[PDB]
């Protein structure tokens, strides 16, 4: 009779018919990643095609059901997530052209080539090539040469195609009643129906700008510190008034500055917090790492693992006996089969990665008692922040000392704390302005606020105004510069990392405050507690059943995106940066150039 019962019946039937297909696709992908053959990839492709066809058919069948007369919030959300048109709004010819463009761009970005002259070939790959070239070099000419050559080789083949790509993206966005593609991306955070906790699409930009306004002082202090260190290191390649060079950031795109910590370490004469020797001396293996991780998670309050997690996961690299990709991914088959695919070895980085994977598995198992359309994170930033907060909390030396890695006799000097804060800021705070600039440029180029003939003109000036990085050589309009990254060249969201970064500090502050702990945040412990674990479990089990605006206050208390936890965390580092940069100049000018 009513439409609600029909909608619920159709949704239950869709879930019951799609759970098996999702499990089969996950099993095929696991068999492919664990055994590189032809039958495995063939079965994986067949399962993916069948899943895509089934999803398209179910979406076409669900589009007949209206969305206004739905009084249930969960049913409305599931219908909105199921009736997604996607690329079906365009014609068949336009769709196949866009698919061919995506495929050729992916192949071009994956192949990679250098082909240096004066040599026979000198044509290396991307990761064993430019990455180690610009990450393990101490010269000014070779890095600039490699950066310019790579950017030119990318532009001369991606400039005529990027225009058609963005045109097709704008057409697909406008065909789905969206004003632009950036609005289509921001619509994931939009919540309707529930009054009192709504969140408009335009409020996200205002919140990001308000957070960036308060992040600006910390970024300016970090830029001044990096400029001072570069002037102390290179006295003829950086000015106290200009911006930082482009090829001296330790990365092809300047996103992560992890390679800069080895050259800008203040107390390099002091030892680090590496516990690799303590692990290799006490006869540690890959199994004991996961055992200690499970002990930590069960002491926090998380339940135990399943009987299939320890008999199906590949915790040991087989080696040359069989091909297997060693890439840490938390696979969720959907039917209680949770397993981690990672070649974990004896390494502190591997320890933190295993902790992150176990946190992801726990987050996935939190909302396991939900329909298929609800067994997923609320947004594209919480699913990774929940896993990263466990790694950020487990990185404290007191936790490793209590477990048994670090010896009890250990000093608590502030030099190691300052070094750790600087290392975290170079990999966390260094990417936020670049992420914001890239996201703003993509939004303004997909909306229409940037002229077509001024893409690079706007890019190279936003790289100097927002970011404190200046290019060492001017580039014309024929070089497709902004599309040199991986996310932009493969249609992947980039603001998700910014949201995850802004939410992980809030989650850490909430978990530290709920554990009845006081004092500094950089050494706050979360284990051996009963209130923080329960407060986290009460929020992780929500999933897509509740809006993120209402779910955020259940673990923290705030109803909006705030940045004050980040300031409270970096205050011990912010004061040190102020004390060290008191005699030096702070800020950068867009007039000076290293030309």
């Amino acid at each position: 009779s009513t439409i609600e019962e029909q909608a619920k019946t159709f949704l239950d039937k869709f879930n019951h018919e799609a759970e098996d297909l999702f499990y089969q696709s996950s099993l095929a992908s696991w068999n492919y990643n664990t055994n590189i053959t032809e039958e495995n990839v063939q079965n994986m492709n067949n399962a993916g095609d069948k899943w895509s066809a089934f999803l398209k058919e179910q979406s076409t069948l669900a589009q007949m059901y209206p969305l206004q007369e739905i009084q249930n919030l969960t049913v409305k959300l599931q219908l909105q997530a199921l009736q997604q048109n996607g690329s079906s709004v365009l014609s068949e010819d336009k769709s196949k052209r866009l698919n061919t463009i995506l495929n050729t761009m992916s192949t071009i970005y994956s192949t990679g080539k250098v082909c240096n002259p004066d040599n026979p070939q000198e044509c290396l790959l991307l990761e064993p090539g430019l990455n180690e070239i610009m990450a393990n070099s101490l010269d000014y000419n070779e890095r600039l040469w490699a950066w310019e050559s790579w950017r030119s080789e990318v532009g001369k083949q991606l400039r005529p195609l990027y225009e058609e790509y963005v045109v097709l993206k704008n057409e697909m966005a406008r065909a789905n009643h969206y004003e632009d593609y950036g609005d289509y991306w921001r619509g994931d955070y939009e919540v309707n129906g529930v009054d009192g906790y709504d969140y408009s699409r335009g409020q996200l930009i205002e919140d990001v700008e308000h957070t960036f306004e308060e992040i600006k002082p910390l970024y300016e202090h970090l830029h001044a510190y990096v400029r001072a260190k570069l002037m102390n290191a290179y006295p003829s390649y950086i000015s106290p008034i200009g911006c930082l060079p482009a090829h001296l950031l330790g990365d092809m795109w300047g996103r992560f500055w992890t390679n800069l910590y080895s050259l800008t370490v203040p107390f390099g004469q002091k030892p680090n917090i590496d516990v690799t020797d303590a692990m290799v001396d006490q006869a540690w293996d890959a199994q004991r790492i996961f055992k200690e991780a499970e002990k930590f998670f069960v002491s926090v309050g998380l339940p135990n693992m399943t009987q299939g997690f320890w008999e199906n996961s590949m915790l040991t690299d087989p080696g040359n006996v069989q091909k297997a990709v060693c890439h840490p991914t938390a696979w969720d088959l959907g039917k209680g089969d949770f397993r981690i695919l990672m070649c974990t070895k004896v390494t502190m980085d591997d320890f933190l990665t295993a902790h992150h994977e176990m946190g992801h598995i726990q987050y996935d198992m939190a909302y396991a008692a939900q329909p298929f359309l609800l067994r997923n994170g609320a947004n594209e930033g919480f699913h990774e922040a929940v896993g990263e907060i466990m790694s950020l909390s487990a990185a404290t030396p007191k936790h490793l000392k209590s477990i048994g890695l670090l010896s009890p006799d250990f000093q608590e000097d502030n030099e190691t704390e300052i070094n750790f804060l600087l290392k975290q800021a170079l990999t966390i705070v260094g990417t936020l302005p670049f992420t914001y600039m890239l996201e703003k440029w993509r939004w303004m180029v997909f909306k229409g606020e940037i002229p077509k003939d001024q893409w690079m003109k706007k890019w190279w000036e936003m790289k100097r105004e927002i970011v404190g990085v200046v290019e060492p050589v001017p580039h014309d309009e024929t070089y497709c510069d902004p599309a040199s990254l991986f996310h932009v060249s493969n249609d992947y969201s980039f603001i998700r990392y910014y949201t995850r970064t802004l939410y992980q500090f809030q989650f850490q502050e909430a978990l530290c405050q709920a554990a009845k702990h006081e004092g500094p945040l950089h050494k706050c412990d979360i284990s051996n507690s009963t209130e923080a674990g329960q407060k986290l479990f009460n929020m992780l089990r929500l999933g897509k059943s509740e809006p993120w605006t209402l779910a955020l206050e259940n673990v923290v208390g705030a109803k909006n995106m705030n940045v004050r936890p980040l300031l409270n965390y970096f205050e011990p580092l912010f004061t040190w940066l102020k004390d060290q940069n008191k005699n030096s100049f702070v800020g950068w000018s867009t007039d000076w150039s290293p030309y």
């Binding site: 009779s1 029909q6 019946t9 239950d12 039937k13 019951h16 759970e19 499990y23 089969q24 039917k335």
Partner: protein
């Protein structure tokens, strides 16, 4: 995967205590009449398990 087991998922009425029926009539939620196949508001009662 085992798919030899089936179960009833939707029907017009519930089951009484200690009642067993092998009727496999198609469920009709909406006012549209069902001719024997699925469609908008027509569904199959039996579903294979996994």
């Amino acid at each position: 995967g085992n798919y030899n087991y089936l179960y009833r998922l939707f029907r017009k009425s519930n089951l009484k205590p200690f009642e067993r029926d092998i009727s496999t009539e198609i469920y009709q939620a909406g006012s549209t009449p069902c001719n024997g196949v699925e469609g908008f508001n027509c569904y199959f009662p039996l579903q294979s398990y996994g």
